[model samples]
Target: RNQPQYPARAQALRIEGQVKVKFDVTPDGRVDNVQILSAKPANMFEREVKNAMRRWRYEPGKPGSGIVVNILFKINGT
Candidate 1:
């Protein structure tokens, strides 16, 4: 059985706010430098988002072939 595994269990997590990050997918199919384009500071959400994004893997972005993924995190409930 193959299933996607999250970095951490979906337990009780408190996020101060959200973090919007913009990262470039390198031609080598790797997540290069990441920039915090926007963020709503709360419970160190920026740091958490950045650290998590660093482990993300991209499919590679060519000259004009790039993809963007927006991750939204909430604190209240699932």
Candidate 2:
């Protein structure tokens, strides 16, 4: 599971954000060149999202491009 950790700054600020990532899938199922397609608040979840994206593993298959994914950061506040 490629799960991104909630940023410490975001936890401190109670900020929840999302990031849209676009990456290419290599033939061996490794993510390549992860890029941010969009961010809910612009630069809030970019780092973590990229980190998680790199950790992800796709099923072994032919090389692919334009694969998009969305990662959301949620915090609990009470």
Candidate 3:
């Protein structure tokens, strides 16, 4: 899970939900061509999630396609 930092505005508003992303993983284990698939609050966490996804490094393997990931956003203890 590429956990994203809750946006300050979202945090203040207590917004929490899941963001789904789709992208391709190169053979070098780097994310590529990331796209937002879905999100409960729409664009709220998209940027942060994308940024985190870009930094993700997977185990080196065959280049993968249509990699889908869902990242949850929530503050502990509500």
Candidate 4:
């Protein structure tokens, strides 16, 4: 599972935010062409979300494109 985690730059500083992103997947099942649909504090968490989502894997033969997801970096108990 490609679970998003709190970014270190924001985590140590206790920055809480969320990012909604839309990305297209290639036929090989890797993420690309990501668009930040929304974010709590602008682009604070966009980069982190992209990195996480870009690493996500899907069925290679499937045309997994135009997928959108939300990532929330909430500060809480570990």
lDDT of each: 0.51, 0.80, 0.79, 0.76
lDDT of 3 by residue, 1-78 (tens): 355677878888877889888898787878788899888987788888777776778677868788787878877763
lDDT of 2: 0.80
The per-prediction CA RMSD against the true structure, in angstroms, equals 5.4, 1.5, 1.7, 2.0
List the candidates' TM-scores in order: 0.55, 0.84, 0.83, 0.80
Q: Give the TM-score comparing model 4 with the true structure, all chains together.
A: 0.80
lDDT of 4 by residue, 5-24 (tens): 67788888877987888877
| Models sorted by lDDT, best on top | 2, 3, 4, 1
C-alpha root-mean-square deviation, candidate 4: 2.0
Question: Could you tell me the TM-score of candidate 3?
Answer: 0.83
Residues 1-78 of candidate 1 have per-residue lDDT tens digits of 111222232323443344565666667565666776666543445555666666666455552233344456554555
| Higher-TM-score candidate of 1 and 3 | 3
> Candidate 2: deviation at residue 56, Å?
1.3
> How many residue pairs clash in all the candidates, one count each?
1, 0, 0, 0
Least accurate 10 contiguous residues by lDDT in model 3:
1-10
Model 2 lDDT tens row, 16-61: 9878888888788788867888898976778877777777786788
lDDT of 2 at 44: 72
Clashing residue pairs, candidate 4? none
